[model samples]
Target: GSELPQMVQQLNSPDQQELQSALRKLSQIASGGNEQIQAVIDAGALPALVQLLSSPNEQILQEALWALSNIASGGNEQIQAVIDAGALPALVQLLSSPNEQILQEALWALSNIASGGNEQIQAVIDAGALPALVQLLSSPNEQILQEALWALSNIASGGNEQKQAVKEAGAEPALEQLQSSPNEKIQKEAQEALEKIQS
Candidate 1:
């Protein structure tokens, strides 16, 4: 009933073209909806998807992050699967990518992962994403700034220790600057993040 199995198979192919095609197609299916997202995961796509995060080809990496981010939005268990697939290190590494799109997508995926409970948030921190996330707070790209703030806010909610970690990483100044962002959502997010840390 789905092309997922073939796509998953192609993900492991030795041919670069086939692997990239599969990544693109799988990402498309992932964005379809929750059920389709789950089906992609159930088809055993996480490991391959995580592996592709390190692809030298920017497009392949972007597609992999897209699908992983969608999968992360499913639920806690689904997020755990992503973590279990060793996505964290590569994701943190991607935060420093020269490509803005890759960095943004990586931040987007980490934001979704941080949206989980304390342990999940800790996993993000433990994976060494905190400093990279804080650094992104100063990114000139508004989308990057927003996504970075979103992930930090989620981590802030984990508890004071987590909030303190964010503060110690020098997030306050950047966040303070964001409070005046032209975008209302960024403005609100910055305000809330500041309150959580300062409270």
Candidate 2:
């Protein structure tokens, strides 16, 4: 296995291939478990990963988003690093990517951020993730639908104003639509989200 320190060095490589390679390696390490995630954090990968979110290469973008998702899966400080590095707006922008994987990773990253505390959720919302996430409620892909719904559910799980924010984003009817979804999991999440937002 390549050394983690070497991978961090590759992140600074001017070559796009090297950068993407580094991101993928770091992503695997980060997703390995909590300990590995902290390792990635210690390597100072968050800033580089966040910067790559705007890479013109689609594969690079995808890999970067996946890395960010894993990094965001860590504790408060780790999640805060990604957010503080200004990943929210970039993730939200990538939601429009034609590639499903890129879109999914972006959604996954944003969902992780939202699942954090109030500051994290508010950071995502401030970066304009709500409207884009709400639009995904009508997505035909069940995975995307479920992921988006889960993110929205977390948003609704916040304070009253946050719940109202989801409703204002036109999520009520979408949740109602999914309440009877053929997919039982989606249906359950939509139902739970609706109850929370309405309460």
Candidate 3:
């Protein structure tokens, strides 16, 4: 419990090893539940976590993304907190990361944030994530494809303007192809998303 402050402090440590360890711990703690996630946020970890998204250290970046994704899973206020921390731009940029793991984690975080509501989805779109997300629908990695589809699905759930943004970004072809996917979950998600956009 008391370790929360120290962990948040370590997030700002100049030592890469210390920062990575703290991020890993924070990720695990955030996954525990909403209250634990809230405690980490209350301890002022969002800015440091968002800053770490740009770390050249792959491990540090992944951990920070994972931690933020967990926090975004909380209620609307929690998701908004992540958005308020200036994470959208960095998070959207990571969608184009060379590392597929980073790309997948970035997509995961974004999908959760987009699920919050239309305003949150608009924040993601305004950060220029739509094209990148549409592009990922063709990724060879099924996991990446799934995460990308999930993110796009949440965005499509928004109002007509948001759905049109996804369509204009060229998501239809990939999403349509996925409707035939052997994986039932992916197929279902693709179908639902396509319906949302078409509706």
Candidate 4:
């Protein structure tokens, strides 16, 4: 915990290896709790983490996505910091990654962002997240389906426009389909999203 400063310093190091090493180290450090999450944010990790998302390295991308997810878990201000750091676009783009782990983290991060607040959720929708989210709605993997529905639920939980956006993205049928998922959680999430859409 006391090593926080050093972690950020290494994270911003000139050497990519050093930066990535710090990122991997801090990934664990960052996800510990809200205090650690804010510590990393205060250490100026958002931009670096967002930048690292473009790396060709899968491990770096995974770690950075995890760090961003942790940061997004904080209050709306911290989640807004992630949005302000230009993460939405990068995150939306990451949805296309072939790797399931990367897809999961990307969805996790966006889900948190969408759950942030109306403004933050709007940022995600405006950044073109709904289409990506809708694509994942039909995923064979229940985890992906659960996450996608969770995000859609949050979006639908927003103002009329946001709810309309999700509805227009053809989410209801998807939600209807997921309503029958054998996984209870997935069915629950889909049912809840449908309820939100109707509300």
Q: Which lDDT values do the candidates have, in the order given?
A: 0.86, 0.84, 0.89, 0.85
Give the TM-score (vs. native) of candidate 3: 0.92
Measured on C-alpha atoms, candidate 4 has an lDDT of 0.85
Candidate 1 displacement at residue 77 in angstroms: 0.9
Candidate 3 has an lDDT of 0.89
Q: How many clashing residue pairs appear in each of the predictions shown?
A: 0, 0, 0, 0
Predicted candidate 4 versus true structure: per-residue lDDT over 1-199, tens digit per residue: 6777787877657787888778878878767777878888888777878888888878878888888888898888889999999999998998888899999999999999988888998999899989888989889987777788878888888988888899898888988987677888888878888888888
What is residue 72's positional error in candidate 2, in angstroms? 0.5
lDDT of 4 at 92: 92
Where does the lowest 10-residue lDDT sum fall in candidate 4? Answer: 4-13
Q: What would the C-alpha RMSD of candidate 3 be, to one decimal place?
A: 1.6
TM-score: which candidate is best?
Answer: 3
TM-score quality measure for candidate 2: 0.91
TM-score of 4: 0.91
Give the winner by TM-score: 1 or 3: 3
Per-residue alpha-carbon lDDT of model 3 for 1-199, expressed as tens digits?
Answer: 8898999999989898888788888888898888988998999999999988878888788888889999999887889999999999998888878888888889999999999888898888888998888888878898998888889999999999999998999888888998778889989989999999998
Q: What's the TM-score of every candidate structure?
A: 0.89, 0.91, 0.92, 0.91
lDDT of 2 by residue, 36-105 (tens): 8888878777777777887888878777878888888888677888888888878888888878888888
Instruction: Rate residue 152 of model 1 by lDDT.
Output: 92
Residue 178, model 1: lDDT of 79
